[PDB]
Amino acid sequence: QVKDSLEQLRCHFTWELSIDDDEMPDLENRVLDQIEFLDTKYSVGIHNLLAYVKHLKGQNEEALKSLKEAENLMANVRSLVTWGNFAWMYYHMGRLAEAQTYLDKVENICKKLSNPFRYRMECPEIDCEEGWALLKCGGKNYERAKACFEKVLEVDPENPESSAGYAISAYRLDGFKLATKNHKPFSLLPLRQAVRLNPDNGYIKVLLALKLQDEGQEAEGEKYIEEALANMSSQTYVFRYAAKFYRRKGSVDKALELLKKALQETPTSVLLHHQIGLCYKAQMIQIKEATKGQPRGQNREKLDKMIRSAIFHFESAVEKKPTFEVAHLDLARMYIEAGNHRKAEENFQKLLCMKPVVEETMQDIHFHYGRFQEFQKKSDVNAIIHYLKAIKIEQASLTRDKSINSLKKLVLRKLRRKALDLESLSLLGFVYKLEGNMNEALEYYERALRLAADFE
Amino acid sequence: NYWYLQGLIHKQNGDLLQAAKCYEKELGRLLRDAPSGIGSIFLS
RNA sequence: AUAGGCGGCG
Ligand SMILES: [Mg+2]
Ligand SMILES: [Mg+2]
Ligand SMILES: [Mg+2]
């Protein structure tokens, strides 16, 4: 009825934003933070998104409040997202006259001079608006968000807004491939473009600095960190990426300072907690190296405090975002480090049921579970099961290569207890095949086949 | 031993990768009920 | 969206 009119509207309700129930507390928290701390030109988008999240929570009057706040801030065409959200709001509540009121407002603006004249309207602004909503709703929406901004840059290649959106989506997709071999810095030129056209935007400067750092250009990146830190623009966000920059440079204490300052503004940020975990992890590794694995007295004291601190923050991260895979894995591994194998295991079992956006993250999950099964749980069969499972995920990566090598070591261990084993001989043949060592691959497979026929 | 012999033929021609595939098919079958899961990886 | 210590007859 009116419902087919609603389905033509370009707004949050029709954009199929991929939002697990599990990610909802976290998303709302990130929406509130952005509203308070992100320096942008139009804050209408994020309140429209706050509205949608309230609506998914079952709090429609709060959702209405957020739409009224967005309206009170409202080019004018971006109001259309607000109005379409209003239309859906009033529908879902059951104010069919009020919904219709707002549909009619959308239609009247859609007659200057829109092609689908009815409720959809095609302009750069609503494209960007779909981009940013997708870009805030988690990694699975990122290819789509990139395409939205890219659509607009196909037409207007010097659009400052969509150049930003495009460059941030790209940097984050680049992020997913840092673990793959033969990753290319696809976001480096877009970020340079984006900084040129949004010269005041510190958020974009710090990601550029991080990309520069990944490509070995530390000096140039550090200038962007120092610049970004000297401007108000998005102080709290600049703090997070500046901290990441200094940690990867090896100024861990400087990182902590920034992260802890940022935690006052945004206590809830799983990014912060995770990254603060990584600072403590890196300090644990420093002490372990300087004391040759045998810390005593005060050193042991400090190592223990840092293991507790990392666990505290990785725990704080996954409580707030249960689907935060990498944070679960780091927690599993901190638990191993602390001697808590059940806690390790428990985090490993939750990891085994996840569908990561980043396929390589499942390789890491199996690799590290397999090592947990070899060295902590003393179960070779499960090590092998899981090293094989990591190997089976096709993607070339350092971690897959690690799994091949871990399988090799374990099977050569087994063959030196018991050389006449059909599985072990076939496994070692397999490993050699995955190394590209084909003479040996065939030699071990042949031995296994000849072992079979001799046994019969 | 049909798959062994198919392997040797590829090996003797230089198709090391088809040689591996042939042997895998037979070693898969032998190891289909192996606890590691290697038998299934071979029969894919 | 928040990556890379060393990896086992160590
Ligand atoms: Mg998050
Ligand atoms: Mg890191
Ligand atoms: Mg990590």
Coil, strand, or helix at residue B12?
helix
A304: left (phi over 0), alpha (psi -120 to 50) or beta: alpha
**What region, left, alpha or beta, does residue A299 occupy, with left being phi > 0 and alpha being psi -120 to 50 degrees?**
alpha
Whether the CB-CB separation of A340 and A314 falls below 8 Å is answered with no
For testing contact with chain B, the best of A385, A411, A445 (most B CBs within 10 A): A445
In DSSP notation, A27-59 reads HHHHHHHHHHH---S--HHHHHHHHHHHHHHT-
Quick count: other Cβ atoms within 10 Å of Cβ A186? 13
The strand pairing partners of A397, in sequence order, are A180
Q: Which of A342, A346, A325 lies closest to A376, judged by CA?
A: A342
DSSP state of A140: G
Structure-solving method:
X-ray
Contacts of A18 (CB under 8 A, 6+ apart): A137, A138, A140, A141
Query: Within 10 A of B32 (CB to CB), how many other CB atoms are there?
Result: 12
Answer for the pair A337, A307: CB distance below 8 angstroms, yes or no: yes
* The dihedral sign for the CA sequence A168, A169, A175, A178: negative
From residue A276, alpha-carbon distances to A252, A312, B14 in Å are: 10, 10, 54
CB A302 within 8 A of CB A290: no
- CB neighbour class for A239 (10 Å; exposed up to 12, middle 13-18, buried from 19): buried
Q: Which domain holds residue B10?
A: 1-44
Please state the length of chain A.
456
A351 CB inside 7 Å of strand C? no
- The 10 Å Cβ neighbour count of residue A311 is 21
Contacts of A267 (CB under 8 A, 6+ apart): none
- Closest-CA distance of chain A to residue B18, Å: 11
CA distance readout (Å), A39 to A46, A148, A158, A201: 12, 22, 21, 8
Instruction: Report the C-alpha gap between A191 and A205 in whole angstroms.
Output: 8
**A431: amino acid identity, one letter:** V
Is A195 in contact with A208 (CB distance < 8 Å)?
Answer: yes
Cβ(A337)–Cβ(A347) under 8 Å? no
Beta bridge partners, A180, equal A397
The residue numbers preceding gaps of C to N over 2.5 A in chain A are: 74
CA distances from A334 to A66, A282, A287, A301, A305 (A): 41, 12, 15, 16, 12
Question: Phi and psi (nearest 5°) for A32?
Answer: -55, -40
A364 close to A329: Cβ distance less than 8 angstroms: yes
In B, which residues are within 8 Å of A385 by CB distance? 35-37
* Amino acid (one-letter) located at A179: A
Report the distance from CA of residue A165 to the C1' of nucleotide C4 in Å, as an integer. Answer: 27
Q: Which residue is nearest to nucleotide C10 (CA to C1')?
A: A375
Burial A246-275 (b: 16+ CB within 10 A, else e): bbbeeebebbbebbeebbeebebbbbbbbb
Phi-psi region of A339 (alpha: psi -120 to 50; beta: other; left: phi over 0): left
Q: What is the token pair recorded at A145? A: 């968000």
Give the Cα-Cα-Cα angle A201, A324, A274 (nearest 5 degrees): 60
Residue A94, Cβ neighbours under 10 Å: how many?
8
Nearest to A376 by CA among A411, A403, A336: A336
DSSP string, A148-179: HHHHHHHH-TT-HHHHHHHHHHHHHHHHHTSS
Give the total number of structural domains in chain B.
1
Q: Residues A374, A319, A383, CA angle at the centre, nearest 5°?
A: 10
DSSP string, A264-296: HH-TT-HHHHHHHHHHHHHHHHHHHHHTTT---
Q: Under a CB-based contact definition with an 8 Å cutoff, are residues A432 and A426 in contact? A: no
Q: How far is CA A352 from the centre of its chain?
A: 18
Q: Which long-range contacts (CB under 8 A, 24 or more apart) does A93-101 make?
A: A93/A60, A96/A2, A99/A2, A99/A6, A100/A2
Query: Chain C bases under 7 Å from protein CB?
Result: 1-5, 7-9
Residue A156, number of CB atoms within 10 A of its CB: 12
User: Tokens 């949050």 label which residue?
Assistant: A12
8 A C-beta contact, residue A379 and residue A373: yes
Q: Give A49's contacts (C-beta < 8 A, 6+ positions apart).
A: A12, A31, A133, A136
Interface of B with A (CB under 8 A): 1, 4, 7, 11, 16-17, 19-20, 23-24, 26-27, 30-31, 34-38, 41-42
The answer to whether A98 touches A114, Cβ cutoff 8 Å, is no
* Residue A314 to residue A322: CA distance in whole angstroms: 11
Domain residue spans in chain A? 1-456
Among A143, A148, A175, which Cα is nearest to A161's?
A148
Spatial contact of A257 and A222, defined as CB atoms under 8 Å apart: no
Cis omega (within 30 of 0) for bond into A331: no
Rounded-to-integer distance, Cα A64 and Cα A147, Å: 30
Q: What angle do CA A285, A287, A292 make, to 5 degrees?
A: 95
**DSSP 8-state code for residue A180:** B
Segment holding A99, helix H or strand E: helix A96-109
Cα A211 versus chain centre, distance: 16
Q: Is A428 left (phi over 0), alpha (psi -120 to 50) or beta?
A: alpha
In one-letter notation, the amino acid at residue A274 is H
Fill in the amino acid letter for A37. F
Asked if A94 contacts A1 with a C-beta cutoff of 8 angstroms, the reply is no
Whether the CB-CB separation of A335 and A344 falls below 8 Å is answered with yes
Q: At what angle do helices A79-93 and A96-109 cross, to 10 degrees?
A: 160
What sections of chain B are H helices per DSSP? 2-13, 16-30, 38-42
Structure tokens at A381: 């069969």
The distance of A333 to chain B (nearest Cα, Å) reads 24
Query: Is A333 within 8 Å of A326 (Cβ atoms)?
Result: no
User: What residues contact A397, with CB distance under 8 A and at least 6 apart?
Assistant: A179, A180, A181, A360, A363
Whether A237 and A202 have beta carbons less than 8 Å apart is answered as yes
Question: Which class for B40: exposed (0-12), middle (13-18), buried (19 or more C-beta within 10 A)?
Answer: middle
- Both tokens of residue A320? 């707030």
